[PDB]
Structure formats: structure tokens, C-alpha cells
Amino acid sequence: MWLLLLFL
Amino acid sequence: NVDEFLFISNNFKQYKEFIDMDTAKHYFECRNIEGLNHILDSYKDSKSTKEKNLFALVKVLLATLTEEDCLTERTYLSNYLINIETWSHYETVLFNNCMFIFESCFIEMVFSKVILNLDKYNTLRYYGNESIRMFVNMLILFIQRQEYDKASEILAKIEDYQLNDDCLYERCCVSFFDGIIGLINGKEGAEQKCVQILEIFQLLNCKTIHHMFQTYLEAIKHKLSLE
Amino acid sequence: NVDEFLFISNNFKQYKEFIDMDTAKHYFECRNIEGLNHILDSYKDSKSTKEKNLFALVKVLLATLTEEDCLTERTYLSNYLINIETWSHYETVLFNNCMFIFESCFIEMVFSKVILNLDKYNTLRYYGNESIRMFVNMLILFIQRQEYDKASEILAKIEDYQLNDDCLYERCCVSFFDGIIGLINGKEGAEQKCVQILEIFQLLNCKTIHHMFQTYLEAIKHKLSL
């Protein structure tokens, strides 16, 4: 459960 | 499905006109025995503005192939495009198909017109990359879960079937990531591979996307420093 | 115009299929030399469900004309329509164009299907009357401003050019209103003209619209006491 999402 | 049908049928004629232009253009590439027939069809017709447009188009196409060149149609097509309140696709497609016939003076002003009304083509272009945006996320996620193999499979797969596409931002992303996989692996070519495309993003002055691709490469380089 | 173009081109094939059916139906009305050509086209093809449908359709059409009854196709078309998760226009248009070929047991069960999925056709009819709903409002307003002449012009105009329509609820509204104008004027027969159509609304059991047309006629009759 890392806190990331989407980006490029 | 009904509403759809209705909608299409209503606009079928307008769509039909696009098909005519396309086929008429094809005939221009070579044979024109039927090329003359379309004129015979739409000569006595010559009612709708768009049907005169078609006529004039075929005219100037035929003309360029024959010895005689008829300019009254050339001027007709000219003024039509010059006087346009709102630029549509039809206007583009026409403009394209007869741009060579056109005097530069028109073309330049037509260009002024068309330069505002590209809004739609642009927003439309974004959604082409809605497929790619998704593909990268997968890769970004696969590396983030250190599934180097999975990520490599995705790439190999999407280069096999995107092989036909001939799109840039695609081939960039695959190359960059074909890099970043090699780099995290530890093979030689890859360290420079990723920067090679990063050049292009800097060179072509895509500061926004350059930033993202760059900062990312640094960020993984960071984590692999630990290795 | 681009998005539209895009949308159409994507669904062109599906639309194209509607055209084939229509033209194939036309051929059935008379000449059929090319009737086999669609087959020649779709025999060597004969792939995809909808293209088999077309094939089978032309088959049973051609067959009905010649001295043959072809069962495998008649059954094929049958089960296709019987097994449909969601009924589309295509399904109707197909069902229509081959209903005569179909056995009644299917037709009745097909009917069961089509009864739910008329939702779209109905809401679509409403907007047909969006023209009429407007026309009456003008009349209703013209009488409300006692512009008897204006109102009568509207009527005379809209009967001249709706002349072609052959629609009921139209001809009702015009007749009813051709009534109350005569009634407010004061010539005889007009008072009875209005009730004549009001019968139809009661007879055909249109309680909703009957109520409105009725209560209105009463309401103007009321004011015409003066």
C-alpha cells in the first residue's frame, strides 16, 4: 500500500 | 441503438460527401474514366453549395490531369473557404484536397482561420494517449512492485503489436522503459538509453514531460544506488 | 463536426447493415437477379452473426419467391431473435422483415421480449408532439388574449401544411380548436364539434388528455356566459 497513483 | 440510427441517418448525406471527396481523390491518383462521370452526375445537379464544391473539386482534379486548366472553379473553391463563419472538418478535408490549386494569398488567410479552430483536433489527440497513459502506469507499477519480468513481458508484447503504429511518444516510452528495465537489471546500454530519449524531450522543448521522465529516472537511480 | 464524423465512421458498418436489409427488402418487392449476388457476397463470407443474419434473410426472401422452403435458415433467423439479451432497433428491423417467415409460437415469445424494450420508441414519440404541444399553446394563448383572428389564422395555416401528416392527435386538436373558435364566435355546430372529438378521447379511454380537453371546454363555456 504505497501512496502513489497516475503520474505521467 | 435507435437514437444512434436516427442520428446517423440524419447526418448521412453530410458523411456521404466526405466519402465522395475521398473516392474522388483516389481517382486522381490514376484512372479517371469514372472521374469524368461524377462531373456528368453533378454538372446538371449543381444545387447544394457542398455539391458545387464536390463538382469544382473533381473539376480542378481532372483539369490538372488534362491539358486545359479551368480557374473559375479554382476561384469558386477559393472564395468558399475564404468566406467561412465556422471552420469544420469538411472545411479542412476540402482545403487539404485542393490546397495545391489554391493561390498562396488565400492559403495564408485560410491558415489564419484554421489556427483558432484546431481546439477540437487537440483535445481529441489527448485521448489517443489514454491507451499509452495506461500502459506506462502498468510499467510504473510493475517496477514499483519489482516485477521486472512482468514489466519486460508487457514491453515485448506492446512493441510487437504497436509495431504498426509509427507513433513517437509511444516509441519513446517503450525505449525509455526498455532502458530503465536494463538499467535496474544492470546491463550497459541502458544507462545511456534512457537519457537518449530524455535528450529528445529537452531538444524538442517539452519541459513538462521532460521533467516527469527525468525526475523519474533520477528517482529509480536513487533507489538503485542502494544496490 | 470531427467528433461526429469519427462517431459515424466507427458505426458505419452497423448502419451499412441496416441499408442492406432495406435494399434487400426492396428487391423482394420485385426483381431479384442481384438477390443472389448478396448471397455470392455473403456465401463465401457467411461469417459474423449479423452477416449470417443478412444471408439468411435474403435466403428466405429469395426462397419465398422461388419454389423452395428453406428450413435451416428460417430456424436460424428464429433462434437468433428468440435468444436476445437486449433488444435493439436492428432486432426490430430484422424481426419485421422476416416476421411472415416466422412461426407464431416464436412471434408471440419474441413479442414478450420486445414489450419491455419499447421504452426508447415511446420517449421518442413525445418529441414528435413537441411541435404540437407548442401549436396548441399558441392557440390557447391567442384565445386567452382574445385574438380570435390570429388564432384562426394559425389553424388555417397548420391544416394547409399538416395536410400531408395524416396524424390523429393533430387532426383532433385542430378540429377541437376549429370548434371553440366557432363557439366563441357563436355559430352553431361548433359547440357540438368540440364534444365530437371529446367522445373519441373518452371512447378510446384517454382519461388524462380527455380531462384537460374537457375541463378547458367547460372553462371557456363558463367565461362565455358574458
Author numbering:
A (entry chain C): 1 to 8
B (entry chain A): 56 to 282
C (entry chain B): 56 to 281
The authors write:
Thus, to help elucidate the molecular basis for pH dependent, and sequence-specific SIP recognition by RopB, we crystallized the C-terminal domain of RopB (RopB–CTD) bound to SIP. Thus, we used RopB–CTD that has the entire tetratricopeptide repeat (TPR) domain (amino acids 56–280) containing the putative peptide-binding pocket but lacks the N-terminal DNA-binding domain (amino acids 1–55). Thus, the region containing amino acids 159–200 of RopB was built as single α helix in the RopB–CTD–SIP structure. Each asymmetric unit has two subunits of RopB–CTD, and only one subunit in the asymmetric unit has defined electron density for SIP. SIP is oriented with its N-terminus facing the solvent-exposed exterior of the pocket, whereas the C-terminus is buried in the deep end of the pocket. The SIP-binding surface in RopB is formed by helix α6 of TPR 3, helix α8 of TPR 4, and the C-terminal capping helix α12. The peptide-contacting face of helix α6 is lined by N152 and F155, and the surface of helix α8 facing SIP has R188, N192, I195, and Q199. The side chains of M267, F268, Y271, and K278 of the capping helix α12 are positioned to interact with SIP. Given that RopB–CTD has decreased affinity for SIP compared to full-length RopB, and RopB–CTD–SIP was crystallized under nonoptimal pH (pH 7.5) for RopB–SIP interactions, it is likely that the structure of RopB–CTD–SIP represents a low-affinity state. In the structure of RopB–CTD crystallized at pH 7.5, the side chains of Y182’ and E185’ (where ‘ indicates the amino acids from the second subunit of a RopB–CTD dimer) are oriented toward H144 but located farther (5.8 and 4.9 Å, respectively) to interact with H144.
The global gene regulator known as regulator of proteinase B (RopB) and an eight amino acid leaderless peptide signal, SpeB-inducing peptide (SIP), form an intracellular receptor and intercellular peptide signal pair that controls speB expression. The SIP peptide is produced and secreted during high-bacterial population density and reimported into the bacterial cytosol, where it directly interacts with cytosolic RopB37. SIP promotes high-affinity RopB-speB promoter interactions and RopB oligomerization. GAS integrates a pH-sensing mechanism with the SIP signaling pathway through a pH-sensitive histidine switch in RopB.
